[PDB]
Amino acid sequence: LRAEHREKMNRMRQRIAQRLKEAQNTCAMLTTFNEIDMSNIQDMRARHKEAFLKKHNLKLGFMSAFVKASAFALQEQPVVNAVIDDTTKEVVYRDYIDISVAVATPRGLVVPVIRNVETMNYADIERTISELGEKARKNELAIEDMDGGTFTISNGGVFGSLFGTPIINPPQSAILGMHAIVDRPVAVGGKVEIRPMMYVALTYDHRLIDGREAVTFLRKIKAAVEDPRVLLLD
Amino acid sequence: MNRMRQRIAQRLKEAQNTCAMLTTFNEIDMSNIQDMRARHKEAFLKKHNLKLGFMSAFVKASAFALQEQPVVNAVIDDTTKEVVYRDYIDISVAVATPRGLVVPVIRNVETMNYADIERTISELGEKARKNELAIEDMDGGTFTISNGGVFGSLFGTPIINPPQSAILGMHAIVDRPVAVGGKVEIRPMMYVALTYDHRLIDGREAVTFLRKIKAAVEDPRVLLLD
Amino acid sequence: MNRMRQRIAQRLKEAQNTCAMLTTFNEIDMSNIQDMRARHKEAFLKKHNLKLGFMSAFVKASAFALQEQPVVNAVIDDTTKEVVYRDYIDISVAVATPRGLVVPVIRNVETMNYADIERTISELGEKARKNELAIEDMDGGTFTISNGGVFGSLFGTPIINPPQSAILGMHAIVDRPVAVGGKVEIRPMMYVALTYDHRLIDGREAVTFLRKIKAAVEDPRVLLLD
Amino acid sequence: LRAEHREKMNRMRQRIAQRLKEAQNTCAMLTTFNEIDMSNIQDMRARHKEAFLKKHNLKLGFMSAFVKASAFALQEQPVVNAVIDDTTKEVVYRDYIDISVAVATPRGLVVPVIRNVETMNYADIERTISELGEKARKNELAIEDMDGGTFTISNGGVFGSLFGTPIINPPQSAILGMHAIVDRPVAVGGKVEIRPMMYVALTYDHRLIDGREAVTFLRKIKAAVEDPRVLLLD
């Protein structure tokens, strides 16, 4: 039996598909990959998760380690923070860092913005994600705090993808895509151990960001997650 | 270049300028398929006069995943800005013969088993080989398998057949060290890819789709269960 | 004894005086069924709200063997001395509740999977438990499974439900030493029995029938193949 | 779709089903089982199968070991050779041994008779089965040499049954049913070895044969297959 039926799409879905194709026809997107060893983050979460819950009443997750390491890399290379506006053919630098965090709730995808990430620590980031996660869950999430982001983390790794290519939020110039954590054999010190590792991806605008600047950017995020004490040093 | 190659390059650029294509990857352990082919390949040839291959395991697992999530089966027609659902499953199979690429269609995959799929591929493989393959059975597919793995590519990005919304790309089988149970074994594994339309399919629905194909090839008894 | 027990003992002796019953035995290794139930019982309960048991593996393997040899599906009617073939498969399942034995019928087993069989047994098990089980759905079966193995019998001889021609009797699962690959392992194995009508079914056709049920329980991936 | 169609059975199948029910309503059938270790037969076939083919142009099988051991047990206990005729209520002894051998060909079951088994050896039995097997295969098998048997071997073991109950050929009083050969663990000498063993069955008439005489009969067949040198001795 061969049955097909035409259901229509509303005017809201019209604009979402319209903005999506404008993001590809504007900027020349490329993608680069790397690989992060997640051993120093898990034992940080293994021994300090109990004193964190007693003192702050929050959960200690992986997400706050990637947001704080992203603000570290952006303030070193400001060209990734930049945006090309094709109205006056201008290059708009910024001096503030607002990282948008895609948190997929039951309803669907929402992308709220964490404001002024430069001065925070892991305790401040965890407050911001938790209470704003409750806002969008019961649908009280405003429009005015969903725009103006300068960089975007995309957790598509809570479902188990190995690696993949993300899509740029069109008022920005780059996006980081984190993925699932698997145990794979690793050659460390000339021996074959098993360590939990993650593939990461970075989709960047090649009109603005150089091919070597995107590699150095993603290599700097790796150094601040394989060893989070670099945030206190250089 | 002739006028036929004019239109092929024309349709190819229309597929990129219409839909916003992205790609996601995963990895399948092919151990339960090979020992199925190791002990049952002799009773299969005596009883059916066919060869037992890898291809029929991917076609049957693809019809299983499509009937669970019908949004991958859908197509956006930009004529009336419509979303066309379908209730039938027709998987197109790219079988590269000596002449070149051909993409015939297997019709109504929902009711078949491995024996029915193997008949359909084998006799239609002989049709396109000696060039008697009609035009009327090359269109209307809803999903596409692309075996580019008979040449030895590690992984790569496929291209969407433009009346469809997704495509699966299988690749070469290599022996790589695998951490299973806290120990380092060697098991034959395959990288797979899924190129999807981001206008229609969500970013989390493409991951769940390819994760469901993996469960029906790492353990083919799920086709009898849920 | 009441007039109901009069007729039950009357029908029982008519089943012996009509057909020439014989019995044949075999032995099934239940290792591939238990690890199927070991890893998929949690995703089965979350997605279907049912329990994953042994019974649905024997009902689906019985419909596989009957559609290959239709002579076991046949019935001799001695009214016109006729041989009545059938093209449908209705397996009767004896489910001993607290009240006693009841034999309801599962209709049209050819198109089902393990999920469909488990729905049919579970909700109809609740009907006969609280005594709302109708008469109209207790007759017309073509084959019968008899679980007398929930009490711990080793093996034994069942009795044919008189409008049918064969009956399968499953039994208890014990761990016994097994010579596999030239070594002595311990594996859970079951004895099975098949009581058949020798007027209709040949002596070699009953052996081939029970050997085919064994192949679809020692390896349940044959249901996807030949 | 529920379709059923009535195809009739011919007048030949009428009588076969008629004779079958007369065999149950006449004699009180019981069944007893035992177990034979087939190790001394297989190494007899392992070393002498080449000199047997060169000198006789025949194949050395399992069947001739069971036919010769059956004529040995019948000439020791003549009561199994007997037949009760209910015409004059008589007990008919016999002094000859004619073993019927059911050899299932492609066409179906046929039961020809081997005549005068008392004087033969393994070479004579193998000639009789082989050339008469070719007769019934191309359908030249006469009627006059299918009746008058006194005992019956039933090879239902070429298909792989474990054990089962056979049916008595109605002019006889007993039937032996051999089965498949499997490797099972065996406690021999206080140790657990693996040896190829066969289950056998004997369906007997309890009107004539005693319950202890059927056990002693099947125990005597076992001794002449576990050790075939008893045929030269006692």
CSV table of N, CA and C in Angstrom, one decimal, chain A residues 1-9 13-14 17 20-21 24-25 33 104-105 108-109 156 158-167 183-185 192-194 199, chain B residues 16-27 76 81-88 90 107-108 155 177-179 182-184 191 198-199 202 204 207-208 211:
chain,number,residue,atom,x,y,z
A,1,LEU,N,0.8,-1.2,0.0
A,1,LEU,CA,0.0,0.0,0.0
A,1,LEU,C,0.9,1.2,0.0
A,2,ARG,N,0.6,2.2,-0.9
A,2,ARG,CA,1.4,3.3,-1.2
A,2,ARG,C,0.6,4.6,-0.8
A,3,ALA,N,0.8,5.1,0.4
A,3,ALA,CA,0.0,6.2,0.9
A,3,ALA,C,1.0,7.3,1.3
A,4,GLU,N,0.7,8.5,0.8
A,4,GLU,CA,1.5,9.7,1.2
A,4,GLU,C,0.5,10.9,1.4
A,5,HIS,N,0.8,11.7,2.4
A,5,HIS,CA,-0.1,12.8,2.7
A,5,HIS,C,0.7,14.1,3.0
A,6,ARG,N,0.2,15.2,2.5
A,6,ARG,CA,0.9,16.5,2.6
A,6,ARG,C,0.5,17.2,3.8
A,7,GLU,N,1.3,17.3,4.9
A,7,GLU,CA,1.1,18.2,6.0
A,7,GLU,C,2.0,19.4,5.8
A,8,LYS,N,1.4,20.6,6.1
A,8,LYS,CA,2.1,21.8,5.9
A,8,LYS,C,3.0,22.2,7.0
A,9,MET,N,3.9,23.1,6.7
A,9,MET,CA,4.8,23.7,7.7
A,9,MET,C,4.5,25.1,8.0
A,13,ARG,N,8.5,27.9,11.0
A,13,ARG,CA,9.5,26.9,10.4
A,13,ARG,C,10.0,27.4,9.0
A,14,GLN,N,9.2,28.3,8.4
A,14,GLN,CA,9.6,29.0,7.2
A,14,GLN,C,10.9,29.8,7.4
A,17,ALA,N,14.2,27.6,8.4
A,17,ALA,CA,14.9,27.1,7.2
A,17,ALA,C,15.4,28.2,6.4
A,20,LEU,N,18.8,29.4,8.0
A,20,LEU,CA,19.8,28.3,7.9
A,20,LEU,C,20.5,28.3,6.6
A,21,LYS,N,19.8,28.6,5.5
A,21,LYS,CA,20.5,28.6,4.2
A,21,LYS,C,21.3,29.9,4.0
A,24,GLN,N,24.9,29.5,5.2
A,24,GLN,CA,25.8,28.8,4.3
A,24,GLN,C,26.2,29.7,3.2
A,25,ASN,N,25.3,30.5,2.7
A,25,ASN,CA,25.6,31.3,1.5
A,25,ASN,C,26.3,32.6,1.9
A,33,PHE,N,39.4,19.1,13.4
A,33,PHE,CA,39.1,18.1,14.5
A,33,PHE,C,40.4,18.0,15.4
A,104,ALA,N,19.7,21.1,25.0
A,104,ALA,CA,18.5,20.4,24.4
A,104,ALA,C,17.6,19.9,25.6
A,105,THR,N,16.5,20.5,25.7
A,105,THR,CA,15.5,20.1,26.7
A,105,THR,C,14.5,19.2,26.1
A,108,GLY,N,12.8,20.9,22.9
A,108,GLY,CA,13.6,21.0,21.7
A,108,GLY,C,14.9,21.7,22.0
A,109,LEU,N,15.5,22.3,20.9
A,109,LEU,CA,16.7,23.0,21.2
A,109,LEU,C,16.4,24.5,21.6
A,156,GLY,N,26.2,17.9,21.5
A,156,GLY,CA,25.4,16.8,20.8
A,156,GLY,C,26.0,15.5,21.3
A,158,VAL,N,25.4,14.0,24.3
A,158,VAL,CA,24.5,13.3,25.3
A,158,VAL,C,23.7,12.2,24.6
A,159,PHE,N,23.9,12.0,23.3
A,159,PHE,CA,23.2,11.0,22.6
A,159,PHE,C,24.2,9.9,22.1
A,160,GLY,N,25.5,10.2,22.0
A,160,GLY,CA,26.4,9.2,21.6
A,160,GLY,C,26.9,9.3,20.2
A,161,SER,N,27.1,10.4,19.6
A,161,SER,CA,27.7,10.6,18.3
A,161,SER,C,29.2,10.5,18.5
A,162,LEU,N,29.9,9.9,17.5
A,162,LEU,CA,31.4,9.8,17.6
A,162,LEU,C,32.0,11.2,17.3
A,163,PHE,N,31.8,11.7,16.1
A,163,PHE,CA,32.2,13.1,15.7
A,163,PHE,C,31.3,13.5,14.6
A,164,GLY,N,31.3,14.8,14.3
A,164,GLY,CA,30.4,15.3,13.2
A,164,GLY,C,30.7,16.8,13.0
A,165,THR,N,30.0,17.4,12.1
A,165,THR,CA,30.2,18.8,11.7
A,165,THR,C,29.0,19.6,12.2
A,166,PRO,N,29.3,20.6,13.0
A,166,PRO,CA,28.2,21.5,13.4
A,166,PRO,C,28.0,22.7,12.4
A,167,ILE,N,27.0,23.5,12.7
A,167,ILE,CA,26.6,24.6,11.8
A,167,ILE,C,26.7,26.0,12.6
A,183,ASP,N,35.9,4.9,25.8
A,183,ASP,CA,37.1,4.3,26.2
A,183,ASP,C,37.8,3.7,25.0
A,184,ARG,N,39.0,4.2,24.7
A,184,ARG,CA,39.7,3.7,23.5
A,184,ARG,C,41.1,3.4,23.9
A,185,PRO,N,41.8,2.5,23.3
A,185,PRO,CA,43.2,2.3,23.6
A,185,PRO,C,44.1,3.4,23.1
A,192,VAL,N,50.3,0.8,25.9
A,192,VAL,CA,49.0,0.9,25.4
A,192,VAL,C,48.0,0.8,26.6
A,193,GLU,N,47.6,2.0,27.0
A,193,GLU,CA,46.6,2.1,28.1
A,193,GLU,C,45.2,2.3,27.5
A,194,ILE,N,44.2,2.3,28.4
A,194,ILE,CA,42.8,2.6,28.0
A,194,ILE,C,42.4,3.9,28.7
A,199,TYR,N,36.3,13.3,20.9
A,199,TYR,CA,36.6,14.1,19.7
A,199,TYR,C,35.9,15.4,19.8
B,16,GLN,N,23.1,20.9,-3.6
B,16,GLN,CA,23.7,21.6,-2.6
B,16,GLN,C,23.0,23.0,-2.3
B,17,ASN,N,22.5,23.6,-3.3
B,17,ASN,CA,21.9,24.9,-3.2
B,17,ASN,C,20.5,24.8,-2.6
B,18,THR,N,19.9,23.6,-2.5
B,18,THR,CA,18.5,23.5,-2.0
B,18,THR,C,18.6,23.2,-0.5
B,19,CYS,N,19.3,22.2,-0.1
B,19,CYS,CA,19.2,21.7,1.3
B,19,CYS,C,20.5,21.9,2.0
B,20,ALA,N,20.4,22.2,3.3
B,20,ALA,CA,21.6,22.4,4.2
B,20,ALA,C,22.1,21.1,4.7
B,21,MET,N,23.1,20.6,4.1
B,21,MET,CA,23.7,19.3,4.4
B,21,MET,C,24.7,19.3,5.5
B,22,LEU,N,24.6,18.4,6.5
B,22,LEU,CA,25.5,18.2,7.5
B,22,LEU,C,25.9,16.7,7.5
B,23,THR,N,26.9,16.3,8.3
B,23,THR,CA,27.3,14.9,8.3
B,23,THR,C,27.6,14.5,9.7
B,24,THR,N,27.3,13.3,10.1
B,24,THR,CA,27.6,12.7,11.4
B,24,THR,C,28.1,11.3,11.3
B,25,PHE,N,29.0,10.9,12.1
B,25,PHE,CA,29.7,9.6,12.0
B,25,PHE,C,29.5,8.8,13.3
B,26,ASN,N,29.8,7.5,13.1
B,26,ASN,CA,29.7,6.5,14.2
B,26,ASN,C,30.6,5.3,13.8
B,27,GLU,N,30.5,4.2,14.5
B,27,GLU,CA,31.4,3.1,14.3
B,27,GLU,C,30.7,1.8,14.7
B,76,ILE,N,10.8,17.7,2.0
B,76,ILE,CA,10.3,19.1,1.8
B,76,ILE,C,10.2,19.4,0.3
B,81,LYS,N,5.7,24.7,-0.5
B,81,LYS,CA,6.4,24.8,0.9
B,81,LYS,C,5.8,23.7,1.8
B,82,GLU,N,5.8,22.5,1.4
B,82,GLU,CA,5.0,21.4,2.0
B,82,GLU,C,6.0,20.4,2.6
B,83,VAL,N,5.5,19.6,3.5
B,83,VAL,CA,6.3,18.5,4.1
B,83,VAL,C,5.6,17.2,3.8
B,84,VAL,N,6.2,16.4,2.9
B,84,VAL,CA,5.5,15.2,2.3
B,84,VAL,C,5.9,14.0,3.1
B,85,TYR,N,5.1,13.5,4.0
B,85,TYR,CA,5.4,12.2,4.6
B,85,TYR,C,5.1,11.1,3.7
B,86,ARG,N,5.7,9.9,4.0
B,86,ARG,CA,5.4,8.7,3.2
B,86,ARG,C,5.2,7.6,4.2
B,87,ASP,N,4.5,6.6,3.7
B,87,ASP,CA,4.2,5.4,4.5
B,87,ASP,C,4.9,4.1,3.9
B,88,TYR,N,5.5,4.2,2.8
B,88,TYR,CA,6.3,3.1,2.2
B,88,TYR,C,7.8,3.4,2.2
B,90,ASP,N,11.3,2.7,0.3
B,90,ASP,CA,12.0,2.2,-0.9
B,90,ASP,C,13.5,2.7,-0.9
B,107,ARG,N,11.9,-2.1,-3.8
B,107,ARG,CA,10.6,-1.6,-3.5
B,107,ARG,C,10.0,-2.4,-2.3
B,108,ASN,N,9.4,-1.7,-1.4
B,108,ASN,CA,8.6,-2.2,-0.3
B,108,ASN,C,9.4,-3.1,0.6
B,155,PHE,N,36.8,6.7,5.8
B,155,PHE,CA,35.5,7.4,6.0
B,155,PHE,C,35.5,8.6,5.1
B,177,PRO,N,42.6,-2.1,17.1
B,177,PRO,CA,42.5,-2.5,18.5
B,177,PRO,C,41.4,-1.7,19.2
B,178,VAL,N,40.6,-2.5,20.0
B,178,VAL,CA,39.4,-2.1,20.6
B,178,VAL,C,39.4,-2.3,22.1
B,179,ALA,N,39.0,-1.3,22.9
B,179,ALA,CA,38.9,-1.5,24.3
B,179,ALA,C,37.6,-2.1,24.7
B,182,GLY,N,37.5,-3.5,29.4
B,182,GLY,CA,38.8,-3.2,30.0
B,182,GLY,C,40.0,-3.8,29.5
B,183,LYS,N,39.9,-4.5,28.4
B,183,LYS,CA,41.0,-5.2,27.7
B,183,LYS,C,41.1,-4.8,26.3
B,184,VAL,N,42.3,-4.9,25.7
B,184,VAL,CA,42.5,-4.4,24.3
B,184,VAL,C,42.5,-5.6,23.4
B,191,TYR,N,33.6,2.4,9.9
B,191,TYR,CA,33.0,3.7,10.1
B,191,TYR,C,31.9,3.9,9.1
B,198,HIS,N,19.4,19.6,7.2
B,198,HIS,CA,19.2,20.2,8.5
B,198,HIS,C,18.0,21.1,8.5
B,199,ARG,N,17.4,21.4,7.3
B,199,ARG,CA,16.1,22.1,7.3
B,199,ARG,C,15.0,21.3,7.9
B,202,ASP,N,16.3,17.2,12.7
B,202,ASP,CA,16.9,17.9,13.9
B,202,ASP,C,18.3,17.3,14.0
B,204,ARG,N,19.6,16.2,16.8
B,204,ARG,CA,19.6,15.1,17.7
B,204,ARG,C,18.8,13.9,17.1
B,207,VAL,N,21.4,11.8,15.1
B,207,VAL,CA,22.3,11.0,16.0
B,207,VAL,C,21.6,9.7,16.4
B,208,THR,N,20.3,9.9,16.8
B,208,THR,CA,19.5,8.7,17.3
B,208,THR,C,19.2,7.8,16.2
B,211,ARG,N,22.4,5.8,15.5
B,211,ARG,CA,22.6,4.9,16.7
B,211,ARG,C,21.7,3.7,16.6
